[PDB]
């Protein structure tokens, strides 16, 4: 009653006490600061190695840290570990759940993970002493569909699900250690910071939350989107990140500034972004629309430098290699193309 | 040396052999999404085909079907429903003997039909609990007109075949419900996908064959659409 009304006004006044601080720290803008920077111009990139062999739609992929091997997942219970240089299918892991929505390649390359509507992030050991690869273990305990599971170390994995929770696990014993709560919507994507001491998470509530891995607290929350956030990725330096939502725009938020710096919106574009990945320098942003093509944005001018028009369906998953050599791009046409 | 190259090239050939064998079984199995609500009766539908996410495996005339009951997830669908944009069909189950929650089923139908990703998937609509509908209509305590004001202005369609020795009040109740789902289906349907409504009870010795017959029809019409015949 009176007590509940006091809490609503007390919490709302804090938002009023933050928004004035946010607008106060807006003396300049990214758009006018970089008005004189030499434009990127036109970025033309053509397909180099189209990878074929997925029966069903490709839902997600991940690059190895060696910038050579990538792993892809498709809705037919197949994890194929591709060799990008030579187009050679190193492994084709058969999955118990034909419905997988994410996959991550470990930085050591010893393991790979995947999860989806099975509600479990399975870990597959690629250095088994025997011929084939098996299931290392099952990380059961989540309630919703696993939307994104990236790797911290060989023994720490961070997962986000449809139950509005990001979880950090321990593969050695398969029990959840730290649970991140605070989202009011399905969580769709993560991003690990380059220092791995933080990670930002975008959910289906137009809010991206920065989390602290070792503490298990959401230290800061970024709002300014209008619809579900479908992908998120840090800036290469780890001092900023960018998001893609269903309202057909991409927004770059600054961690230190605390507000959105610049939005990447076009009048012709009315399709939700499905995947975002920065270039190695951070000067380009690559956004994979479900308008059947990817657009290479000037990350300090909001100018479409170029378009990667080569897909016959929704662009599912997009990634850039660590060295920034080339850009893979899965899709729902079951074909994972590599651009450069 | 190029000795390692030969080993990689033969492992790719071994992989490709297994992928071809997995392609044959993947195309020979029809995947179905089994939607519905808390009281819909998908539980008793899967008991007929028994002969987190849950899969039901059955065959009719030596044709394998996969049915997925997505049960483990939350009440928000807008992001896990996009996974099933490749399924042969949606098996949608509705409780025809609960008029209060019947409007919920119509809104869910509308969102599925008009989805940017599912606008090509046909629906095998199942109106379960027809037995409970018979007794409720003859009870007279609950009125369709209480929930649906256009039931008063509705007549039993000419192209309707009542069951042997059936009360005609029930037939007019049944076919008003059916027409409510079909009314949505035809408003935006552009031949990309079709609805296949059916009247089933909890005691049917069927709905394995009905799905098989409707699945073959869905597969027939995509061929003709490719041929520009339809």
């Amino acid at each position, epitope marked *: 009653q009176s007590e509940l009304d006091q809490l609503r006004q007390e919490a709302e006044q804090l938002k009023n006490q933050i928004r004035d601080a946010r607008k106060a720290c807006a003396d300049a803008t990214l758009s006018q600061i970089t008005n004189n920077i030499d434009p990127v111009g036109r970025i033309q990139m053509r397909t180099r190695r189209t990878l074929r062999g997925h029966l069903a739609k490709i839902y997600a992929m991940h690059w190895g840290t060696d910038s050579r091997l990538l792993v892809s997942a498709s809705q037919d219970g197949k994890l194929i570990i591709w060799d990008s240089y030579t187009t050679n299918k190193v492994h084709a892991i058969p999955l118990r759940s034909s419905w997988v929505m994410t996959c991550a390649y470990a930085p050591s390359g010893n393991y790979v993970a995947c999860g989806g509507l099975d509600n479990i992030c399975s870990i597959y050991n690629l250095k088994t002493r025997e011929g084939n690869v098996r299931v290392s273990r099952e990380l059961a305990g989540h309630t919703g569909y696993l939307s994104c599971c990236r790797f911290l170390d060989d023994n720490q994995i961070v997962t986000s699900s449809g139950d509005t929770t990001c979880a950090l696990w321990d593969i050695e014993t398969g029990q959840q250690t730290t649970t991140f709560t605070g989202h009011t919507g399905d969580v769709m994507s993560l991003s690990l910071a380059p220092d791995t001491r933080l990670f930002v998470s975008g959910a289906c509530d137009a809010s991206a939350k920065l989390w602290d891995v070792r503490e298990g607290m959401c230290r800061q929350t970024f709002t300014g989107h209008e619809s579900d956030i479908n992908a998120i990725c840090f800036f290469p330096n780890g001092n900023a990140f960018a998001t893609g939502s269903d309202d057909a725009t991409c927004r770059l938020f600054d961690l230190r500034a605390d507000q959105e710096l610049m939005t990447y919106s076009h009048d012709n574009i009315i399709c939700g972004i499905t995947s975002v990945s920065f270039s190695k320098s951070g000067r380009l942003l690559l956004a994979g629309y479900d308008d059947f093509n990817c657009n290479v944005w000037d990350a300090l001018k909001a100018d479409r430098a170029g378009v990667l028009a080569g897909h016959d369906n929704r662009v599912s998953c997009l990634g850039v290699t660590d060295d920034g050599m080339a850009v893979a791009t899965g899709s729902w046409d079951s074909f994972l193309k590599i651009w450069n | 040396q190029r000795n390692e190259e030969k080993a990689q090239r033969e492992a790719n050939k071994k992989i490709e052999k297994q992928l071809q064998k997995d392609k044959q079984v993947y195309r020979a199995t029809h995947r179905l999404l089994l939607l519905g609500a808390d009281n819909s009766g998908k539980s008793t539908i899967v008991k007929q085909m028994r002969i987190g996410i849950f899969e039901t495996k059955f065959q009719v005339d030596k044709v394998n079907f996969h049915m997925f009951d997505v049960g483990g997830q939350r009440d928000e669908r807008r992001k896990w429903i996009q996974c099933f944009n490749d399924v042969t069909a949606i098996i949608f189950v509705v409780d025809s003997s609960d008029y209060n929650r019947l409007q919920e089923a119509l809104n869910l139908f509308k969102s*599925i039909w008009n989805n940017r990703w599912l606008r090509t998937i046909s629906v095998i609509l199942f109106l379960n609990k027809q037995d409970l509908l018979a007794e409720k209509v003859l009870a007279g305590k609950s009125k369709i007109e209480d929930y649906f004001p256009e039931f008063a202005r509705y007549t039993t369609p000419e192209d309707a075949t009542p069951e042997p020795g059936e009360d005609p009040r029930v037939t007019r109740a049944k076919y008003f419900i059916r027409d409510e789902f079909l009314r949505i289906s035809t408003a935006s349907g552009d031949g990309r996908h079709y609805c296949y409504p059916h009247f089933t009870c909890a005691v049917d010795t069927e709905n394995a064959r009905r799905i098989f017959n409707d699945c073959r029809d869905i597969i027939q019409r995509m061929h003709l659409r490719q041929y520009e015949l339809l």
Partner: nanobody
Amino acid sequence: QVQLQESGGGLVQPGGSLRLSCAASGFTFSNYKMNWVRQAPGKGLEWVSDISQSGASISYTGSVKGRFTISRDNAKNTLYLQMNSLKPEDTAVYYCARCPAPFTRDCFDVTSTTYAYRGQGTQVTVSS
């Protein structure tokens, strides 16, 4: 920030009239289809009505059909629900739900328990 604040709602005699105003902020009101959903005491959320971007396509739940009137004003970013007659059965809290994706006809999860894009809502009470 996507915020939806609802006005009106209050004690009313049966067969009276009341107007609900939903003010939208932090998004282009012009693109998202809107909705009205009500939660009766000890009962799940029910869908009441929806309105398209241009107001052309309007529907209703049937239990309120031709008695509730829904209108939107893209100029002021305001969504209305004109209640003409007030049956005692419609005693519930009214939320001003917004469809998730902008340029789509489909409107999933507006009646979910924990939906993100649904306002706080105002309790509408009808009694003698």
